[PDB]
Symmetry: D4
Subunit: 205 residues, 8 copies
């Protein structure tokens, strides 16, 4: 696979005049206020991916942010609740046209309790994703080849998954449910940033 590695931002949007872009992030941890965004991955759904290393203290990435803001382009995530939070905290823009394969999995793969990306890719595409056998310092000045391949591998399959999940949501007549969930997901992320990350706001207690 071809993986293009960039510093700071995309050079241009020539490769992203499309209807949907797959998006993922890597960080130093699960807490956006402590653990900075380190790498952002994008894919057009073809056999290539873009991996953008983000510098410490970087507040802007103009081309990427133009992609994130374009209402005409659906951003595909796996568990977008986190990626939306860290992206909004880092660059100040919250995407509002999104698709999340984890919510879709919870709405369609009702015969299992395993909704991780590895299990989804294995079941839906017969593609074997190999997951890192160790964690690493994503803030390293120079990423290893294994890191680059793993980061690109996290976005290469989201288009095919979205297509399959759209077929399943149509078959079982749950399209409007998913649509409402996706509409609320950015605000769920905002609730996380504001301090309710450990609270199910809709629960009785």
């Amino acid at each position: 696979t071809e993986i293009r590695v960039h510093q700071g931002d995309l050079p241009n949007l020539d490769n992203y005049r499309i209807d949907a872009v797959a998006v993922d992030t890597e960080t130093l941890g699960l807490q956006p206020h402590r653990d900075r965004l380190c790498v952002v991955q994008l894919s057009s759904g073809d056999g290539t991916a873009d991996v953008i290393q983000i510098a410490k203290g970087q507040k802007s990435a103009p081309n990427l942010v133009r992609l994130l803001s374009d209402r005409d382009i659906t951003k595909i995530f796996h568990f977008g609740r986190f990626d939306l939070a860290i992206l909004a905290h880092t660059f100040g823009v919250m995407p509002d046209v999104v698709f999340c394969t984890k919510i879709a999995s919870k709405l369609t793969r009702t015969y299992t309790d395993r909704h991780g990306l590895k299990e989804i890719c294995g079941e839906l595409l017969n593609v074997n994703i190999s997951k890192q056998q160790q964690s690493s310092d994503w803030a390293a000045e120079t990423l290893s080849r294994a890191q680059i391949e793993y980061a690109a591998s996290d976005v290469l399959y989201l288009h095919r998954l979205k297509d399959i999940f759209e077929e399943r949501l149509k078959r079982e007549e749950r399209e409007s449910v998913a649509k409402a969930c996706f509409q609320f997901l950015p605000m769920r992320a905002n609730l996380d940033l504001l301090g309710w990350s450990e609270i199910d706001i809709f629960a009785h207690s």
Copy 2:
């Protein structure tokens, strides 16, 4: 306290030419598929209430349902997640313009973990609500006077709470958060009806 008790439906909406109506329900239990709707309470905020007994197997209540469907009238609930579910299950109409005092409490009364209606009314209005010392047969053919007064007490104060909560949401600058939560609440209730009542659809696990 004037409490008007009706069988089946309101006679008309002459008392409900207003911008917001407080709504509550009573049932035989927490599971809409097993436990039928027994009582619906309404208040215009003028210190009076309407208590409508719903018959077993009743499928229609055109005047009440006309009120519930009117998008120009905000329906105020406390923990509307349940009431919306049972109302939609019973009458086939899902309200889509709502305000929930429990979500508002969780978004504003951040200094406590106790969000029940009795406590909210106590703190915000210095009004003492006396709650039943046991449960009762809400399906009884004739409700007792104590039952009627208890049922009306659940709607008499929701307008005043909504006014106060709106002041607090404005003060802490969380109005758009609450608006998005209320917009999603009917779909959360629908998700409950469809079989996800025990699942936080946005959680990682």
Copy 3:
């Protein structure tokens, strides 16, 4: 109330030529293999009760056992799962025509999670049962008056409860469910005696 106290057995069945008898027991504890039966209580529903003190090592109680065996008389219990076990373990006869107010409560009082006898009697009859504020031996040669009255209070109201629960079971269309539960209850007690007292035999795990 007149409470007649007997040693070992009823003198005769002159007071029990009836269709239903209320039954309760008092033991040295919850484990029938260790904790012996001490008292058996009966009521015809006429507001009087018989309290039969059972001696240590007693193997027979012929008049009582004739009552327990008579298929034309329904035995009413509250949580008969236990009483059936201790009676069968002590006298060798398992009743097979029974009614249990706890199962009936779980099938009809779906609006609460409190199914104890005190709450049922309070909510269904407005009768205040006063429960012992301390424990007792019950193996005492001579029971106190307070002890005798506390024991009688457990059988004095079961007929009225059975009548009301039968009305509710008919109303909610659960008569055949209750009948099957009562038909299985003696075997559930037998399973307890055989060693499965801590196992839900129908659970997946």
Copy 4:
């Protein structure tokens, strides 16, 4: 291994003029109100099995349903509590002559806590059951060969297990216990359909 795959129903009952039939199901999940019946598997106890694909919204399967309601034919299940529930919900007929290998295991294999079908077949028959390599889409229009073979494997051994268990139920003198449990099992499944699926109806709490 001959596996005949059908859509909707058996062509005839020529293969099922027998005293007992092994039955299993596959669904979209564990909740009958949400997750539809997708496959029914049958076996005569021979080296072949019948796999019947059930269409979405299908209300009738007359030849199969005649088999399910034939009181002269024992239906053998593993954990029939579920299969009975989904079958009764889908076709409106509750079988009432059943044998469950999981209840039998809990009554006889008291030296282990693993009562799943794989462990039982391994210990009792030295047969190696290979389980699904993923939780596939049982609602697929065309089942894969792996799916068909896995579905058949669930019924091929239930006759031999039923035979062995009935020797250890007579050896350990538990025949009447097992018979009563099997007689109650359809009502346990009905209770599941009515809304008590999470409730041990016989427990103290």
Copy 5:
């Protein structure tokens, strides 16, 4: 009631020419290695008690310790597991003739799960023990009168309890079990001193 308060040790054993003595202690906490012995209380079973203040770092109390080591005198404790440990840690002598009302309660009062001294005295002697409403500094140079009376109240009733528990142990044919438990109790206390305070040494895991 007469309470004699002493510094360091009894002046003599003139009041303790008896076959059994009730013993209790007070400390700065539950961990003998950190929390020193502050008070020891004794009673002959009559209407008076002796309360002995132990100084910080005190290693010897010859008259009291003489009493503790006299094998012709049974030492009565409530939950002697603790008192034996702290006494041996402080004075270097482990009593080996003991009676514990907590073990006796667990072996006889099988109809309850509350085995504390207050509950025992109330049920077996209709005596109301009033327990201090706030812990206090038992190491204070001068004990208050209320403190002294509480400390004495903890030993005044143990003889009467021992007599009743012995009657019950004979009645229920558990004398040899209880005797063997009391014989083992000092070694359980030694195990506590050696570092096994959180381990049931007889448990499977």
Copy 6:
């Protein structure tokens, strides 16, 4: 007591030329990043207290911060872990000469597990603190008299507690332990602000 209420800051430090000042805060909740500081309370150890209401968005309080920064003045807190965190978050200055009555209680009152201020004041001083039991909105523009009295009550007694705790720490030879804990406490609060508030940094796991 005389309680002087101020907006924003002390007028001067004329009342605080002292060696130790008692400090407490009130906020909108437990999470410093979400819940703003609303009230700061101070006491010289006399019979009066100062209550300074802090406005939304206030960044500066020069007289208060002079007191908080003065290394020659010990700041007495109860559970200073929180107050230090919120003070440093609000005004940008972390006090570094502190005494915490809760740590001292945990180091000296080893005979109890209840270390709250009400219980400590009750035991050590025989002073009854009455708690609001209401939990009001401390950000209100005008505080009620009850709010002012409750807020002052939290600082009026800390000097007397500090004196007693110092006596006990000397008696049990734990002075250097307390000194080390107090020296680390500001860094524990900083760790809370940085994102480790739910992590015991010294735990094995």
Copy 7:
């Protein structure tokens, strides 16, 4: 591995004129009142073992019981708490001179939390025990060779373990602790038979 299999009893005691015998049992489960004794294994400590099949309903085994009753012969068990209980329940004799390798392990192998026989034999002897990969029917008329060998492996190594544990107990000066524990172990087993199997009789709660 000479293994002699017998029916009912040893033919004689010619192989057991020794000072310590390794003993183990197999049953149909963990509950002696429900699960009968099926096999008894004995070893003189040499390279051979005796495996005695016990018949259903068998009440006597005179030669075995002669061995179990002999006070001059130490019975070595691993987790003798169970074996003593089932032996006493089956044959009516409680051994009173015992050694348990699990208690010894808990008193000496303080550097691990795994006290099972496999771990002990592996660490202390470098002997690899391969345990049953599936439970089995120990009541089978004919045991398989693999089954018999598994049964023999449980007694073949206990003498060597006892020798090592006694040396280690001497090294850490815990001989009298172990002796007292072994003396109490038969009464712990009796307590299990009487109904306290789930209770640590020495715990505070």
Copy 8:
């Protein structure tokens, strides 16, 4: 590798004229009051290590203790909380210049919750340490070759880890936090020795 094994103490400090020494211990268990220190491992950070066997009852090791006391030499531990406790308990000297790789990991490796030495060495150095298959008797008079190699492997890499963690702490600007944690760590160990080993002294509860 070169591993020098000594009895009692180092002969001299000729190999330890360095700024920092890696230190680890092995014991008979986790409780210093019960489980004696058995082995001490030292490294200069080069490819060799010293392994010192400590005798039972040994109170002094002058050269080792001289090293531990020298404030110009930083002692590197992994989870030094334990080693500091056991060293001070055994030799009476509490080191006060320390670096702990577990605290450093918890302050920098925020992207994982697994902070054990094996994981750290695997991630940071790509060195695979193979750990024993169980624990072992570290009190043996003669250690095995496998024991000696396993013990040396625990100190051989701490210098390289300290260098990497120090670079990361500078990078993420947490140097002063780490320094304060390390300054408090010896007092945390002292708190463990004094009896607060199970208590987070800074927690609210």
